C-alpha cells in the first residue's frame, strides 16, 4: 500500500569489475570482484580462490582500483560509486577480526556537468601521485593522493576535446601523462597531455596521432621498458610511442568487437583480450630492446566476459554479466597443440533476469522460481529452490523397498556395517565394507517374511520383527535365541520396538513384550476399541531405554491415545481430524522439549506437546507437508535429534529457539529412510524411492539450489502451464546471412535441437537476423519437447498461458509484431493461440492486428491485449476464434499491462500511467485515473486495489496511489506519489509469489539485470513507523564502508533531481540489527516505542526487536556466508 518493505532475496550475481593485487597482505595475491553493491575479496591459492571477506556498500560500484602509495606496506583500494561517493579503503586484520577501514572519503560530483557517453572513467597514475576522474564532458578531475587530502578534495582541468572514448595514464613519463582517444567532426584521434603539478593544468603531451581507426575504443598503457599505448579498434590494433608506430589487422579478430583486456606479465609482453562473443585472445608484443611487431592468438572460448583478470599458474578469472563467471586454465601444450583454454570452475550468474515465474505458489510445499536468464550462448533457464540438500555418495538399483534398518553385526564395532531392507513378503540384508556393499544372509533372520522392524537390542542381541513373529538373535553366536508368536499364531499388524522393550499390535489386540538375556517375555495384553494404525515406544526422557508411554492410532475413529507401560491404561485421548486414518505416530524430544507427532494418509501432520509424567496434548497444530502419507524416522544431527519425514515432499523437522521448523529436502521423492553411520559412510543416511537405494549425507545448512538449463540462445519470456507439466518460453537466436539465399545458425541451440518441431511458414552479406521461437520445455526433465518458429521478421513479444471463455483447454498465446528496418512503428502483428498436446504444438487460432502486441493478460476469462496505443478486449467463442469486444484508445503506447479484478494498469516507457476499469453493463472501458511524469520506466505491478508499484530510471522504485481523500473528479483521477526509493538495481519483471520463500502482507518478487532478486511486501502504518525510527537509529551505529550515509544512498535519484526516500523500509538495513553487539542493540531501541496490539506503546527492549527482526528474516531466502 503506502508502507512497503523491500528486502533482498538473492544478492546480485553479475560481475561488473575484477582487479588483482595485495590488499589483504603484502604477501597475499588477491582477487577483488565487484558485484554492484557488493565487494568480494579472495586470496588466490594454487588450488583456486579462498573467500576471505565480502562487504556491501551504500552505492553502486563504478570504479575499483588498487594502488600503493609510497611508504605504504600493502595496496589500498579506491572506490567511486555511481552517485560520486569516493573513498580510499584499507584492509585490517587483527587475528581473526577483519575490518575495512576508510582512510579518505568525499563526494566528487560537480554541481553542474554533462555526464559523458562512455560513462565514469577512473584512473590512477603509476607513481600514485593522483586519481584522475573523467565524469563530465570537458573536464578532467584530479584528486591529489597527498596524505593530508582525507576529504579527497579535487581540482578540475578543462579538456578541449569534449568526446573522450577512453583514457589512461602512461608509464615511463617524467610527469603524470594521460593518453586518450577522442572523436570530433574531423574523425577519431588519440592525444596525450602532461599534467602540470604546479599549475594544475595540462601541458602539451609527448605525442599524438590523428585519424586512427573510426572504431578505436580502448586504450592500454604499456609499462616499461617499452612504454607507449596500445589502441584497440574493431579491425585493427595499433601501438604508439613518441617516434614509434605499429599496426596489425589480423583476420583472427575480424568477427567480433574486443571489449575487455588484461595485462598478463608486469612488463607488458602479453595481454588477454575478450570479444563480445566469448572469444579469448592473447596479444603478444614482439621485441627485437625494441618493440618490432604485434601478434594475436585465439586461445579458445569463455563465457562472454565483462572483465578478465590473470591470476597465477595459467589461471584466468572471467567475470560475466551475460552468463556464468568462470576460472579458466591456459594449457601448457602450446608448442605441439597450440594455445588452448580449459574451464576449471563455474560461478552462478542469474543476470540478466529478463522474466521469471513462480511454480507451487501454495505454501504447503515451498514454491520454486524459474527465471529467463542470460543472453545469446549464455542464455539459460534457472530453477531456484530453497531446501536442505543431500550429497549422494552411492546409488543401488533395488526396486520395491518397503523398509530400511541400520544394524551393527559386530558388538565390538561402534559403526553400522549392515543395512536391512524389507520387500513385500521378503527381507534382504546388505553388508557394508567401506564403500563396498554386498548382499549377504544374516543367520537367525528370516528372508521369507516382510520385516516391520530390525535393530540392535540390549544384551548384545539383534531383533527382527515380522508379521509372522518377533525373533531375538545372538550377536557372537549369530543364532536365534528366542521367538514370540501370537497365541492363535495370527500375523502382527503393527510393530514397535526399542533396545529394552517391544510392543506389537494384531488387529485391535496389543501385546507388550520386554527383551531379557536370551529371553522374550509377554508382560501385558490389551484390547482396543478400534483397529491399530501405528505404535511408538521411543524412550523419551531419562531411562534404561525404557518408555512408560505407548502411542497408538485408531483406524475406525482416528485418534492418538497414549497408554501407560506396563499399565496399558490410556492416560490421554487426542483430537480426531476427520475420516483420513493415521499412518505414522512418533514421540521425539527436541532440545529439552517433548512432542508427539502424528502423520495421516491425507499427508496432514498433527504435532501435540506431551509431558512424560502427564502425557496430555500441549498444543494442537496441523502442518501439511505433502499429499502422500508421511513416514517419520528419528535421526541425529550434531548432538540434537531431528525427524525426517518421508512423503512426496521429504521434510526435515528442526528445533531452533524452541520452535518447530519444517524445512524442505531438495530430493524428488522418498518413501523410506534411516540413518547410517558406517566406516565408509559416517553420519550419513540411506534413502529409498520406488526403484533405488541411495546413501548420502545432509548439507547441514539450508541453501539456494539452482538448476541451470542451458539454451545456447536468448530466453525472453516464460509461463508455466500446470495441466501440461511444461513451461512455454519465447526465445530468439541470431543467424547470419548465408551465401545460398538463406540464413544459418551460429551453433546448435534449444530452438534447433527440439524433440519435435514446427514452423509458421515454409518460406525460402554477413548481416545478422533474429529468429524467434516458442519453446515447450518439460518441467521435470527440462527437455525441449517442442520448438515452433515464427515468421521471418516476426518478433515475438508477449506470452500467456490460460483458459478462455467456456473452453476447457489451456492454451499458449503469443503476441507478435512484424519488424522491418525501413518501418519505425510496426503496422502488422498477430495473436496466435497454440495448444500443446500429443507432444505437438497446434495452431488453434490466429488473429491479425495492425500493430505490435506489446503485452497480454487473461482478464476474467477474456484476453486483454495492448496493440500500439490501443488496449483491446477479446472474447473466445465456441468456434475457437477471438472476437473483439471493445477497444480503448490511449494517448500512450501500452507497453506495460497489469490487472486486478475489473481494473487495468496501463504503462509506457516514459512513466505515463493510466488506470482503466472495464464496465460490464457497457461492454467498454472507463478511464479512472492517470499520472504523466516523464522518466524511463522498466516494469510495473499492482500491489492492491489502490496502489501500484513501478521501477524507474536511475534504479529507483516508486509507489503511486488512487487517493481516497478526494471528492472532486479531478482529485480522484489523479494518482498520488506515496513511495520513492533508490533500489540500486534495474527491474525487468515484477511477479506475485506469495509464501514462496515462507508483520508483512502480500508478496511481490522482482528480478533484475544484475541477477539480484528482491521482495516487496506491505506494512501497516504502525510497523512502518517503528521500522522507520529503527532505521535512523541503526544508521548512527552501523559502520558504513566509505562513510556513505544510508539516507543519501536510498534517496530517489535522477540526473536532474534527488529526493529523500519515503514509503519504503530497507529490509537489508533492518536485518543488520541482528549482527550488532548487545550494548549497541540497546542504544538502538532506547526511547523506541513498541506498539503491541493493545495500542498502548511501551518501551522497546532489545529482545522485543530481536524477535521482530528474526521473524522478518523468515519472509525471504537466507543469504550464504561468503568466507569459511
Amino acid at each position: 500500500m503506502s508502507y512497503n518493505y523491500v528486502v533482498t532475496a538473492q544478492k546480485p550475481t553479475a560481475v561488473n569489475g575484477c582487479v588483482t593485487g595485495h590488499f589483504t597482505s603484502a604477501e597475499d595475491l588477491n582477487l577483488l570482484i565487484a558485484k554492484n553493491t557488493r565487494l568480494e575479496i579472495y586470496v588466490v591459492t594454487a588450488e583456486g580462490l579462498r573467500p576471505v571477506k565480502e562487504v556491501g556498500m551504500y552505492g553502486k560500484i563504478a570504479v575499483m582500483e588498487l594502488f600503493r602509495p609510497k611508504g605504504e606496506s600493502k595496496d589500498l583500494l579506491f572506490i567511486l560509486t555511481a552517485k560520486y561517493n569516493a573513498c580510499i579503503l584499507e584492509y585490517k586484520q587483527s587475528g581473526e577480526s577483519i575490518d575495512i577501514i576508510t582512510r579518505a572519503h568525499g563526494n566528487v560530483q560537480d554541481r553542474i556537468g554533462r555526464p559523458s557517453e562512455t560513462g565514469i572513467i577512473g584512473i590512477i597514475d603509476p607513481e600514485c601521485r593522483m586519481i584522475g576522474l573523467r565524469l563530465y564532458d570537458g573536464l578532467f578531475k584530479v584528486i591529489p593522493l597527498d596524505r593530508d587530502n582525507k576529504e579527497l578534495k579535487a581540482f578540475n582541468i578543462r579538456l578541449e576535446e569534449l568526446h573522450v572514448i577512453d583514457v589512461k595514464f602512461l608509464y615511463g613519463c617524467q610527469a603524470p601523462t594521460i593518453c586518450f582517444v577522442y572523436q570530433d567532426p574531423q574523425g577519431r584521434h588519440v592525444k596525450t597531455y602532461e599534467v602540470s603539478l604546479r599549475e594544475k593544468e595540462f601541458n602539451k603531451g609527448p605525442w599524438k596521432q590523428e585519424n586512427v581507426e573510426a572504431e578505436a575504443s580502448m586504450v592500454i598503457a604499456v609499462p616499461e621498458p617499452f612504454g607507449g599505448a596500445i589502441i584497440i579498434g574493431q579491425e585493427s590494433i595499433t601501438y604508439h610511442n613518441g617516434d614509434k608506430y605499429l599496426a596489425i589487422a589480423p583476420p583472427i579478430i575480424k568477427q567480433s568487437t574486443i571489449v575487455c583486456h588484461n595485462r598478463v606479465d608486469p612488463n607488458g609482453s602479453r595481454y588477454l583480450l575478450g570479444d563480445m562473443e566469448g572469444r579469448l585472445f592473447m596479444l603478444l608484443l614482439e621485441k627485437e630492446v625494441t618493440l618490432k611487431d604485434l601478434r594475436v592468438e585465439l586461445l579458445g572460448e569463455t563465457s562472454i566476459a565483462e572483465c578478465l583478470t590473470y591470476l597465477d599458474n595459467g589461471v584466468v578469472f572471467v567475470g560475466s554479466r551475460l552468463g556464468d563467471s568462470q576460472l579458466v586454465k591456459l594449457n601448457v601444450d602450446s608448442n605441439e597443440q597450440g594455445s588452448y583454454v580449459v574451464a576449471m570452475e563455474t560461478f552462478t550468474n542469474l543476470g540478466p533476469i529478463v522474466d521469471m515465474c513462480v511454480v507451487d505458489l501454495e505454501r504447503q510445499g515451498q514454491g520454486q522460481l524459474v527465471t529467463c536468464s542470460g543472453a545469446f550462448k549464455e542464455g539459460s533457464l534457472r530453477i531456484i529452490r530453497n531446501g536442505i540438500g543431500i550429497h549422494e555418495h552411492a546409488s543401488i538399483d533395488l526396486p520395491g523397498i518397503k523398509g530400511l534398518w541400520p544394524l551393527r553385526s559386530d558388538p565390538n564395532r561402534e559403526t553400522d556395517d549392515t543395512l536391512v531392507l524389507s520387500f513385500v513378503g521378503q527381507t534382504r540384508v546388505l553388508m557394508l565394507n567401506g564403500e563396498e556393499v554386498e548382499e549377504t544372509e544374516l543367520m537367525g533372520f528370516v528372508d521369507d517374511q516382510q520385516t516391520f522392524f530390525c535393530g540392535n537390542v540390549a544384551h548384545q542381541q539383534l531383533i527382527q520383527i515380522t508379521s509372522a513373529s518377533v525373533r531375538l538373535v545372538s550377536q557372537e553366536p549369530k543364532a536365534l535365541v528366542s521367538e514370540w508368536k501370537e497365541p492363535q499364531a495370527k500375523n502382527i499388524s503393527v510393530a514397535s520396538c526399542n533396545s529394552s522393550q517391544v510392543v506389537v499390535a494384531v488387529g485391535r489386540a496389543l501385546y507388550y513384550l520386554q527383551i531379557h538375556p536370551q529371553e522374550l517375555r509377554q508382560i501385558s495384553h490389551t484390547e482396543m476399541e478400534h483397529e491399530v494404525a501405528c505404535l511408538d515406544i521411543t524412550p523419551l526422557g531419562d531411562s534404561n531405554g525404557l518408555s512408560p508411554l505407548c502411542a497408538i492410532g485408531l483406524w475406525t475413529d482416528i485418534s492418538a491415545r497414549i497408554l501407560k507401560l506396563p499399565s496399558f491404561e490410556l492416560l490421554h485421548k487426542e483430537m480426531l481430524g476427520g475420516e483420513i486414518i493415521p499412518r505414522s505416530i512418533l514421540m521425539t524430544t527436541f532440545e529439552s522439549s517433548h512432542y508427539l507427532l502424528c502423520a495421516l494418509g491425507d499427508g496432514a501432520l498433527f504435532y501435540f506437546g506431551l509431558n512424560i509424567e502427564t502425557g496430555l496434548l500441549s498444543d494442537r497444530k496441523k502442518v501439511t507437508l505433502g499429499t502422500q502419507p508421511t513416514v517419520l524416522r528419528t535421526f541425529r544431527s550434531l548432538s540434537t535429534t531431528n525427524v525426517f519425514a518421508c512423503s512426496d515432499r521429504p521434510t526435515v523437522i528442526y528445533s531452533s529457539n524452541h520452535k518447530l521448523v519444517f524445512s524442505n529436502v531438495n530430493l524428488k521423492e522418498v518413501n523410506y529412510m534411516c540413518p547410517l553411520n558406517s566406516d565408509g559412510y559416517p553420519d550419513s543416511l540411506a534413502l529409498a524411492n520406488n526403484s533405488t537405494l541411495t546413501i548420502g549425507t545432509i548439507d547441514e545448512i539450508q541453501k539456494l539450489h539452482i538448476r541451470t538449463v542451458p539454451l545456447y540462445e536468448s530466453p525472453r519470456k516464460i509461463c508455466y502451464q500446470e495441466v501440461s507439466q511444461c513451461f512455454g518460453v519465447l526465445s530468439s537466436r541470431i543467424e547470419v546471412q548465408d551465401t545460398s539465399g538463406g540464413t544459418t545458425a551460429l551453433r546448435p541451440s534449444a530452438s534447433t535441437q527440439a524433440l519435435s518441431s514446427s514452423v509458421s511458414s515454409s518460406k525460402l552479406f554477413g548481416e545478422e537476423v533474429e529468429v524467434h521461437n516458442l519453446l515447450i520445455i518439460d518441467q521435470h526433465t527440462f527437455e525441449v519437447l517442442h520448438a515452433h518458429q515464427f515468421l521471418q521478421n516476426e518478433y515475438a513479444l508477449s506470452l500467456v498461458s490460460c483458459k478462455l471463455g467456456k473452453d476447457p483447454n489451456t492454451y499458449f498465446i503469443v503476441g507478435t509484431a512484424m519488424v522491418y528496418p525501413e518501418e519505425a512503428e510496426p503496422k502488422q502483428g498477430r495473436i496466435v493461440v497454440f495448444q500443446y498436446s500429443d507432444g505437438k504444438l497446434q495452431t488453434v487460432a490466429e488473429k491479425e492486428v495492425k500493430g505490435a502486441v506489446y503485452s497480454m493478460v487473461e482478464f476474467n476469462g477474456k484476453l486483454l491485449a495492448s496493440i500500439n496505443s490501443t488496449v483491446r478486449l477479446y472474447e473466445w467463442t465456441t468456434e475457437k476464434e477471438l472476437r473483439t469486444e471493445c477497444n480503448h484508445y490511449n494517448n500512450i503506447m501500452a507497453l506495460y499491462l497489469k490487472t486486478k479484478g475489473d481494473f487495468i494498469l496501463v504503462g509506457d516507457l516514459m512513466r505515463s500511467v493510466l488506470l482503466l476499469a472495464y464496465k460490464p453493463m457497457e461492454g467498454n472501458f472507463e478511464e479512472i485515473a492517470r499520472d504523466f511524469n516523464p522518466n524511463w520506466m522498466s516494469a510495473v505491478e499492482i500491489l492492491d486495489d489502490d496502489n501500484f508499484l513501478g521501477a524507474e530510471n536511475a534504479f529507483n522504485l516508486f509507489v503511486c496511489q488512487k487517493d481516497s481523500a478526494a471528492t472532486t473528479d479531478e482529485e480522484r483521477q489523479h494518482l498520488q506519489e506515496v513511495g520513492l526509493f533508490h533500489l540500486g538495481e534495474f527491474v525487468n519483471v515484477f511477479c506475485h509469489g506469495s509464501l514462496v520463500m515462507q508483520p508483512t502482507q502480500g508478496s511481490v518478487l522482482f528480478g533484475t539485470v544484475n541477477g539480484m532478486i528482491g521482495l516487496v511486501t506491505s506494512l501497516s502504518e504502525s510497523w512502518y513507523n517503528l521500522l522507520l525510527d529503527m532505521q535512523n537509529r541503526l544508521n548512527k551505529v552501523i559502520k558504513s564502508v566509505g562513510k556513505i550515509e544510508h539516507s543519501f544512498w536510498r534517496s530517489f535519484h535522477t540526473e536532474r533531481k534527488t529526493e529523500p526516500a519515503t514509503g519504503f523500509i530497507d529490509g537489508d538495513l533492518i536485518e543488520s540489527f541482528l549482527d550488532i553487539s548487545r550494548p549497541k542493540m540497546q542504544e538502538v531501541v532506547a526511547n523506541l516505542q513498541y506498539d503491541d496490539g493493545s495500542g498502548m506503546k511501551r518501551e522497546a527492549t532489545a529482545d522485543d526487536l530481536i524477535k521482530v527482526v528474526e521473524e522478518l528474516t523468515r519472509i525471504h531466502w537466507s543469504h550464504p556466508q561468503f568466507e569459511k
Partner: protein, 376 residues
Amino acid sequence: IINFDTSLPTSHTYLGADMEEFHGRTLHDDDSCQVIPVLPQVMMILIPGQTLPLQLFHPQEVSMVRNLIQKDRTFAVLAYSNVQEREAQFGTTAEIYAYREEQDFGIEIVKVKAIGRQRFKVLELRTQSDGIQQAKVQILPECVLPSTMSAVQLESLNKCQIFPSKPCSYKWWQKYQKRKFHCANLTSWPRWLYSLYDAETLMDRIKKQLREWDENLKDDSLPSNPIDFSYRVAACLPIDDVLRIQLLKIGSAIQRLRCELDIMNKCTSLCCKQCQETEITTKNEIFSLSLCGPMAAYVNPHGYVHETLTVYKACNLNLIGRPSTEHSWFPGYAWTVAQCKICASHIGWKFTATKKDMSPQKFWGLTRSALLPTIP
C-alpha cells in the same frame, strides 16, 4: 521563392522604425512560484521560443510595459481553456527583446517584440486597480531525460557508445540503432521500441516528413537541439487550441516530438472551424515563407494578434475589398480579406505580389483560429 527575402516576415518591419533591443538572461528557478503581469487583450497560446509582436494603445497597458522594460521585461501569456470565462490553468512567460514607444500627435503607442521562454501552471489569477492582471504562477520544468540505455548500458560497451558521424543514410540509421541500443538485450524490450523514444531518430522522422511536404526546406532550418526543435515545430503546427494546450502541457522533448509525429501522420486536411463543410487547403500547399516556419504570430493595426499560415493554394474562399499594402506582414505583397464561401467567416487573406519579378506571385495567409485540422 524568388525576390522574397524569407527573413523579412520575422523582422516585423510593419511595426515601424528600428526598435531598441534588450538582451535578457531572466529565467525563473524550476518549480518556483512567481507573480507575473498579464496583458488583458492578448488571447494567443504562446509556445517557448515563439516571437510575439504586440501593439499597445491603452494607457494602462503602455504604463505596465514601460515599467516592465525596467526590471525582468517578462509578462505572462495565458493559454485560455475558456476564452469567454477567461479560464486558464497553463501559460508561457514572454520576455520583451524589442521595444519602441510612439508619442507622435500626442498619441501614445507601445510596440514590443517578445519571445516565449518558460511554461507555467496558473496557481492564482488576480486583477489589479490599473486593470492589469497579476498571475500567481508555478514554473513547469523542462524534463531532460538521459539515454534509455544509460541505466542498462554495459561498462565494457560504454567505449563503443560514441559512433562516427553520419555522411541520414538508411544504412547509417540501422547501424545507429544496433550500437546505441545493444544493451536492450539486458531488458524486456527490443531496440526498435527504444528508437520510438529516441530524440535524434524522432527529429529525423519529422524532418523527412516535413521535407516531403516542403522540399523547399533544403537547408537545416530546424534547430539541432531536441527541445528547440520540438518547440519550433509545435509553434508552426496548424492545430486546434485544445491540441496546442496539450502540446504545451508536455514537459519532455521526446513526448512532444512523438505527439508532433502522430499529428503530422494523422492530419491531412484543413477546414473552416465555423461551418466545417469547406476544405480551405491541404498539407502539400503549406510552405515556409519565413525562416521561423509556415505559421507565425503577426499583430494587426488594432493590436490583435493572428497566427498566419502561408499556403500556395487555398480553395472555397471569397475575396472582399481591394488589395492593400498597408500594414502588410509580408513586404512586397498586398492583402485582400478572404471569407469562407458557405459561412462568410474570415479565414484569412490572399497575398498578391506588387512586382512581376517576385515569386510566389500569389499566396494565402490563413488564421489558425479560423481553421480546424481534419483527419481523413
